[PDB]
Design a protein around this ligand. Structure first.
Ligand SMILES: [Zn+2]
Ligand SMILES: [Zn+2]
Ligand SMILES: [Zn+2]
Lengths: 88, 725
């Protein structure tokens, strides 16, 4: 009549780390256009640029929340070992 | 005394035109002198010199003022029989030359020669040479010439090189040769061809000029190995060169060009080798071929046009044609002269990054895209497969084009979003194809460039591994109802994007929860975000009067499993049950409609143009029928490819900004205080290897870098900044 049956199904999923979404981590306030610094200091080009910076350890924080950490420490603010970057 | 000198001359007068006089004579003559120097005997030389200085004066009397090819038949034989005799005379005066001439603190034979350039300092310096030229003028024809007639002449002036007191002569004597002949030779030789060049120049061919002026140069080289002396050849050549090649360069440049417009190619080799000679000769042909092929390319692609714009094989191919065409020309006709290889490369670079194609697309960056898209079309599961070497080869060709790509970030970035999909879907042509491509690219741009291509790869093997872990976990206390398979990719390493808010149709719940459970047994906290926009699955129909195995996207399966109940839903209805955004449903429903698994109320509606509105019904077409069992209706939106290209390009624009900033800071740190222009300049020096930022973009980054307080302007200075930490 009107019958379709799922025989195969190849899914695909990304796997993150889950020290939850809850926010960013190194400024914590969701991976939104917030990251703290941009929210207040808004209407500035530096805000219209706020993106996620993916680790290599797979922790990712706003670009800024990390650019601005590195000027100081290089290690990963969540997995001890150093940064590496990749993807924006 | 006057005694031996009367009989000594008696013999000396005989030693010349020698009647093969008996050695009895020489023996006498020798000791005749031995004693004459012992009775200082200085006089003897004085007598000898006189005798010589006289005999010749008398000799000159004969053949006197009889230039020519007169002196020819003469000055040769004369110098000849004189030489030998003078030679024999020295052998005789030997005792003289010894104890007289070391007393210095002035040989005879030498005296013989000096004494002869007093036959030279007369007619035989002036009209005889001017005879030789008369014979040499037989460069044109004739024969024959009898080189012997000039050899003697030549070897003479050479020999008469001079010998009035230096002692012996350190370098070649050859002052007389040049000044008495060489000079008078060259000057007269030039006019010959200077007349024949211009003669020919107008009456014969820019091809059949080089062909000749080529040979004659050779001749002139020939006529120096037999009527020489040693370097009158390069000086001779340096000369004939200036007369045949290089005062004729402009008369060659205009011809060279035509030789291109017509693939008349050995005409170019000779065109080259000729100008090859003249110093700084190629400098122009190197600009003509440089700018020439540039056209060919800018044209051959121009023909393709709106097509090439969306046909990578064509675009890249038309390009690899102009290249492989003119490359073999430089390798052939231009003797792979790196200077001409430059011309090629400079031109290829010019028209590969900018041409009718890029212009249409409005950006240099299309080129790398089309080179990306090509490779994918090449590393993608082919309708059959490609021949190993074949692929590997074209893949080595794609890299020749890559070699000229300005926006390699663009190429790379594409070749990445493409490898992603290929990996994600086990849709690669040959695995050793990719593996080679990644290498092929690693070489130029190091591990860093290809790192991500490798991260994705190795990250995929993992998924395969984990998949098994799950396939195994099944024949364990856990059976699955449908063939499940999953790719668990590291949210960080791939270029994907989660998704469009799906609702996971029931028939997939089991497989979701289970594996979601099975993945709990691995990374305590690990999040799985299910990329439904990217997942496969097959469907098997029982409703159509035939068994089709629909190979479909998860969204299609979702909307399709929806027909397992009430039969025809409007769009709103699917965008609620499937929970799949209209914006996305529509395009998918577009597809499902285009394959007639679904058919709208209006049988005339041109699905491929009609617009989907929430209220528009979407009847399941039950009469459906495909010329194939197992139909792959998972070709999503046509437009997707466009938004991909678009969103993927913009994903780069924002990525060059950061790399640019990350340079500014980098530079501003190393320098601390720097002037605008120099800052800008540096930025390029840095980024050239990947892409040439447009000043206005950097200008932007600079400000952003100021806002983000990484560097500021030096209050009280035109265009200056200080690295503020
Ligand atoms: Zn943050
Ligand atoms: Zn921010
Ligand atoms: Zn980390």
């Amino acid at each position: 009549k009107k019958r379709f049956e799922v025989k195969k199904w190849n899914a695909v999923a990304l796997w993150a780390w889950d020290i939850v979404v809850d926010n960013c981590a190194i400024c914590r306030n969701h991976i939104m256009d917030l990251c703290i610094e941009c929210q207040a200091n808004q209407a500035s080009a530096t805000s219209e640029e706020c993106t996620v910076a993916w680790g290599v350890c797979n922790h990712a924080f706003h670009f800024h929340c990390i650019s601005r950490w590195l000027k100081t420490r290089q290690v990963c603010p969540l997995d001890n070992r150093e940064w590496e970057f990749q993807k924006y | 005394l006057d005694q031996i000198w009367d009989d000594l001359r008696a013999g000396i007068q005989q030693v010349y035109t020698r009647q093969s006089m008996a050695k009895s004579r020489y023996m006498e003559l020798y000791t005749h002198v031995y004693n004459y120097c012992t009775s200082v005997g200085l006089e003897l030389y004085k007598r000898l010199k006189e005798f010589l200085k006289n005999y010749l004066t008398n000799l000159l009397k004969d053949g006197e003022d009889l230039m020519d090819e007169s002196v020819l038949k003469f000055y040769t034989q004369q110098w000849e029989d004189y030489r030998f005799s003078s030679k024999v005379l020295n052998g005789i005066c030997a005792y003289l030359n010894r104890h007289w001439v070391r007393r210095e603190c002035y040989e005879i034979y030498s005296l013989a020669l000096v004494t002869w350039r007093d036959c030279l300092f007369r007619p035989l310096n002036k009209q005889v040479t001017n005879a030789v030229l008369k014979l040499i003028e037989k460069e044109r024809n004739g024969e024959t010439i009898n080189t012997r007639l000039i050899s003697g002449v030549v070897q003479s002036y050479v020999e008469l090189g001079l010998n009035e007191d230096d002692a012996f002569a350190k370098g070649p004597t050859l002052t007389v040769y040049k000044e008495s002949f060489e000079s008078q030779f060259l000057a007269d030789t030039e006019r010959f061809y200077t007349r024949e060049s211009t003669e020919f120049l107008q009456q014969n061919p820019v091809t059949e000029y080089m062909k000749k002026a080529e040979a004659r140069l050779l001749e002139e080289q020939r006529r120096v190995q037999v009527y020489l002396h040693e370097s009158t050849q390069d000086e001779l050549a340096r000369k004939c060169e200036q007369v045949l090649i290089e005062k004729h360069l402009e008369i060659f440049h205009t011809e060279f060009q035509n030789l291109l417009d017509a693939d008349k190619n050995e005409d170019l080799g000779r065109m080259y080798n000729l100008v090859s000679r003249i110093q700084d000769g190629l400098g122009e042909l190197k600009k003509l071929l440089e700018t020439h092929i540039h056209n060919q390319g800018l044209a051959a692609i121009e023909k393709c046009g709106e097509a090439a714009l969306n046909d990578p094989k064509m675009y890249v191919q038309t390009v690899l044609d102009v290249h492989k065409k003119y490359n073999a020309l430089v390798m052939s006709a231009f003797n792979n002269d790196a200077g001409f290889v430059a011309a090629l490369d400079k031109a290829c670079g010019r028209f590969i990054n900018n041409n009718a194609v890029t212009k249409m697309a409005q950006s240099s960056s299309k080129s790398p895209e089309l080179l990306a898209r090509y490779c994918d079309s090449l590393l993608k599961k082919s309708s059959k497969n490609p021949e190993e070497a074949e692929l590997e080869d074209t893949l080595n060709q794609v890299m020749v084009v890559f070699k000229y790509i300005e926006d390699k970030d663009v190429f790379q970035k594409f070749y990445a979003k493409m490898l992603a999909k290929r990996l994600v879907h086990q849709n690669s042509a040959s695995d050793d194809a990719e593996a080679s491509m990644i290498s092929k690219l690693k070489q130029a741009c190091g591990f860093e460039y290809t790192s991500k291509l490798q991260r994705m790869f190795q990250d995929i093997g993992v998924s395969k591994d984990l998949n098994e872990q799950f396939k195994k976990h099944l024949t364990n206390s856990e059976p699955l109802d449908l063939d499940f398979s999953i790719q668990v990719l590291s949210s960080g390493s791939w270029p994907f994007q989660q998704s469009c808010t799906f609702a996971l149709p029931s028939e997939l719940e089991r497989s979701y929860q289970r594996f979601t459970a099975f993945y709990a047994s691995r990374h305590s906290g690990r999040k799985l975000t299910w990329l439904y926009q990217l997942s496969k699955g097959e469907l098997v129909t029982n409703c159509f009067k035939n068994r089709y195995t629909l190979q479909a996207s998860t969204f299609q399966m979702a909307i399709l499993l929806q027909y397992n109940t009430e039969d025809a839903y409007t769009v709103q209805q699917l965008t609620d049950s499937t929970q799949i955004k209209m914006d996305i449903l529509a395009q998918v429903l577009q597809i499902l409609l285009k394959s007639k698994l679904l058919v709208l109320e209006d049988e005339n509606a041109n699905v491929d143009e009609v617009e989907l509105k929430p209220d528009t019904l979407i009847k399941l077409y039950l009469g459906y029928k495909n010329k194939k069992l197992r139909v792959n209706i998972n070709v999503p939106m046509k437009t997707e490819q466009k938004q991909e290209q678009e969103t993927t390009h913009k994903n780069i624009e924002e990525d060059r900004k950061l790399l640019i900033q990350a340079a500014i800071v980098r530079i501003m740190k190393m320098r601390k205080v720097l002037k605008h222009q120099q800052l800008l300049g540096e930025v390029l020096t840095q980024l050239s290897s990947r892409f040439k930022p447009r000043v206005p973009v950097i200008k932007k980054c600079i400000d952003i870098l100021i806002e983000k307080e990484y560097l500021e302007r030096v209050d009280g200075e035109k265009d200056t900044y200080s690295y503020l930490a």
